[PDB]
Design a protein around this ligand. Sequence first.
Ligand SMILES: [Cu+2]
Ligand SMILES: [Cu+2]
Ligand SMILES: [Zn+2]
Ligand SMILES: [Zn+2]
Lengths: 151, 151
Amino acid sequence: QDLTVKMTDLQTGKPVGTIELSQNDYGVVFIPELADLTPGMHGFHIHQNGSCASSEKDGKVVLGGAAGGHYDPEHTNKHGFPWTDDNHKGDLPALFVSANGLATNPVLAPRLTLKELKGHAIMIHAGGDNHSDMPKALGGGGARVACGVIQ
Amino acid sequence: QDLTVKMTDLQTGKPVGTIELSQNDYGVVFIPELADLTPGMHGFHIHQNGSCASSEKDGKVVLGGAAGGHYDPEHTNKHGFPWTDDNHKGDLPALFVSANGLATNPVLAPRLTLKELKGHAIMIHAGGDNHSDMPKALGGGGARVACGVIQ
Ligand SMILES: [Cu+2]
Ligand SMILES: [Cu+2]
Ligand SMILES: [Zn+2]
Ligand SMILES: [Zn+2]
């Protein structure tokens, strides 16, 4: 009852490692073993669709845009924290990337179950995540930089 | 049912800001508003005693050593993750500090209640926290750099 998720850099198309998912009594733990990411904090969320392909919007290309918006099974239409209920269930703690571009700090999502994640996608943004739609939408994560489909 | 914790740099004796504690259905959230910390990830745990004073050990001074060891109400005598039960209940997610020395990323501790924290101390280390006693004890947090007593 743990799954392996292969993550790919959306810009380069190359693998950046994997993320292992596990279920415990307090929620789902995401344990990253990634590399080649920019140091700092990055938005980290489950997205709705099971794809990492691009999408299009007003004539411009959206890397990993086919993955849809944030997982939001309760139709909240709001971005928030991992421990608040009236926002996307997909909202995870932000992912920390070391000066050496590695991401190994595991994080917990108390509102998710492992069973419901199958078929969705894990997204790593460029920006961080202040867990609010202000001053920028979706926690200010901005562009999608790494993505993997949960199988 | 939120408390304010004033945090002090143990080396300089000066204030570094505060941490607000809150209780929700998923555990206790620590929301930092700190500054003047080294960038990177730092060990972050509740310690047993209600003091931030120094201690002594084999003739050398331990900054914030009077706060005791990690909060460990189940007598596990092991350092682990915030979502694993056979380790110190005091074990929190690591605290992220920006390049500008600020700490504002909130973290959740699903195993703690607000009521039980009164009288203990919040500790911020120098090192990080791999949530293991290997290869270094207590997640490799090492020296204590900032501390505050929960009132
Ligand atoms: Cu996202
Ligand atoms: Cu500690
Ligand atoms: Zn969201
Ligand atoms: Zn510990």
